[PDB]
Design a protein around this ligand. Structure first.
Ligand SMILES: [Cl-]
Ligand SMILES: [Cl-]
Ligand SMILES: [Cl-]
Ligand SMILES: [Cl-]
Ligand SMILES: [Cl-]
Ligand SMILES: [Cl-]
Ligand SMILES: [Cl-]
Ligand SMILES: [Cl-]
Ligand SMILES: [Cl-]
Ligand SMILES: [Cl-]
Ligand SMILES: [Cl-]
Ligand SMILES: [Cl-]
Ligand SMILES: [Cl-]
Ligand SMILES: [Cl-]
Ligand SMILES: [Cl-]
Ligand SMILES: [Cl-]
Ligand SMILES: [Cl-]
Ligand SMILES: [Cl-]
Ligand SMILES: [Cl-]
Ligand SMILES: [Cl-]
Ligand SMILES: [Cl-]
Ligand SMILES: [Cl-]
Ligand SMILES: [Cl-]
Ligand SMILES: [Cl-]
Ligand SMILES: [Cl-]
Ligand SMILES: [Cl-]
Ligand SMILES: [Cl-]
Ligand SMILES: [Cl-]
Ligand SMILES: [Cl-]
Ligand SMILES: [Cl-]
Ligand SMILES: [Cl-]
Ligand SMILES: [Cl-]
Ligand SMILES: [Cl-]
Ligand SMILES: [Cl-]
Ligand SMILES: [Cl-]
Ligand SMILES: [Cl-]
Ligand SMILES: [Cl-]
Ligand SMILES: [Cl-]
Ligand SMILES: [Cl-]
Ligand SMILES: [Cl-]
Ligand SMILES: [Cl-]
Ligand SMILES: [Cl-]
Ligand SMILES: [Cl-]
Ligand SMILES: [Cl-]
Ligand SMILES: [Cl-]
Ligand SMILES: [Cl-]
Ligand SMILES: [Cl-]
Ligand SMILES: [Cl-]
Ligand SMILES: [Cl-]
Ligand SMILES: [Cl-]
Ligand SMILES: [Cl-]
Ligand SMILES: [Cl-]
Ligand SMILES: [Cl-]
Lengths: 6, 6, 6, 6, 6, 6, 6, 6, 6, 6, 6, 6, 6, 6, 6, 6, 6, 6, 6, 6, 6, 6, 6, 6, 6, 6, 6, 6, 6, 6, 6, 6, 6, 6, 6, 6, 6, 6, 6, 6, 6, 6, 6, 6, 6, 6, 6, 6, 6, 6, 6, 6, 6, 6
């Protein structure tokens, strides 16, 4: 799993 | 699964 | 499945 | 597990 | 385990 | 175990 | 065990 | 055991 | 045992 | 109820 | 009820 | 209830 | 209750 | 209760 | 109760 | 009770 | 009770 | 009771 | 009075 | 009075 | 009065 | 009066 | 009166 | 009156 | 009156 | 009156 | 009156 | 003079 | 003079 | 003169 | 003159 | 003149 | 003249 | 003139 | 003139 | 003139 | 030369 | 030359 | 030359 | 030359 | 030459 | 030459 | 030459 | 030459 | 030459 | 190949 | 290859 | 390779 | 290799 | 190799 | 090798 | 080798 | 070898 | 060898 948030 | 949101 | 929305 | 936050 | 905080 | 604090 | 404090 | 204090 | 105090 | 707006 | 507007 | 706003 | 704001 | 602020 | 501030 | 301040 | 100050 | 001061 | 424009 | 603009 | 701007 | 700014 | 700034 | 600054 | 400074 | 300085 | 200095 | 464009 | 742009 | 930009 | 920037 | 910077 | 810096 | 430094 | 240093 | 040193 | 696009 | 993009 | 970006 | 970045 | 960084 | 660092 | 360090 | 150290 | 030490 | 979409 | 997205 | 993201 | 992050 | 972090 | 930390 | 610590 | 401590 | 202590 990969999550990216900005 | 891939999701992209902006 | 592919969905694109703008 | 890797988490990065700034 | 490694944790870094600043 | 290693801990560093400043 | 090693501890350093200043 | 070694202790140093100043 | 060694102790030093000043 | 569901509402979506953009 | 369903409404769609664009 | 769920609300999302950006 | 959960609230998230950025 | 949990609150986080930065 | 736990509080952390920096 | 525990308090830490620096 | 324990207090430490420097 | 124990007190230490320097 | 109601006005709607898009 | 209510006004909404996006 | 309420105003919201983003 | 309440004002919030970020 | 309450003011908060960061 | 209370003021806090860091 | 109470003042604290570090 | 109480004053403390270090 | 009490004064302490070191 | 008034001009409006969208 | 007034100008508005988004 | 007033200017606002975001 | 007033200027505000963030 | 007043200037504030952070 | 007043200047404050931290 | 007053100057304070720490 | 007053000067204080520690 | 007064001078104090330790 | 002038070009405008939206 | 002038270019503007948003 | 002038360039502005946000 | 002038450059500004934040 | 002048450089400022924070 | 002048340099300032904190 | 002048140097200051703390 | 002048040097000061504490 | 002058030297002072304590 | 060139593609443009808005 | 060049890609641009906003 | 060059990548730019904001 | 050069990487810049803020 | 050069690394800079703040 | 050079390392600097504060 | 040179090391400096305060 | 040189060592200095205070 | 030289040693100095106070
Ligand atoms: Cl990515
Ligand atoms: Cl993509
Ligand atoms: Cl597509
Ligand atoms: Cl990373
Ligand atoms: Cl690291
Ligand atoms: Cl380390
Ligand atoms: Cl060490
Ligand atoms: Cl030692
Ligand atoms: Cl010894
Ligand atoms: Cl939907
Ligand atoms: Cl969602
Ligand atoms: Cl979330
Ligand atoms: Cl969290
Ligand atoms: Cl924690
Ligand atoms: Cl702790
Ligand atoms: Cl302790
Ligand atoms: Cl002890
Ligand atoms: Cl309608
Ligand atoms: Cl509405
Ligand atoms: Cl709202
Ligand atoms: Cl709010
Ligand atoms: Cl608050
Ligand atoms: Cl508080
Ligand atoms: Cl306190
Ligand atoms: Cl006290
Ligand atoms: Cl006492
Ligand atoms: Cl109109
Ligand atoms: Cl308007
Ligand atoms: Cl406005
Ligand atoms: Cl304002
Ligand atoms: Cl202010
Ligand atoms: Cl102030
Ligand atoms: Cl003061
Ligand atoms: Cl004083
Ligand atoms: Cl005195
Ligand atoms: Cl035009
Ligand atoms: Cl323009
Ligand atoms: Cl401009
Ligand atoms: Cl500027
Ligand atoms: Cl400046
Ligand atoms: Cl300066
Ligand atoms: Cl100085
Ligand atoms: Cl001096
Ligand atoms: Cl002297
Ligand atoms: Cl084109
Ligand atoms: Cl382009
Ligand atoms: Cl670029
Ligand atoms: Cl760069
Ligand atoms: Cl650099
Ligand atoms: Cl350096
Ligand atoms: Cl040095
Ligand atoms: Cl030396
Ligand atoms: Cl000597």
């Amino acid at each position: 799993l990969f999550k990216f948030f900005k």
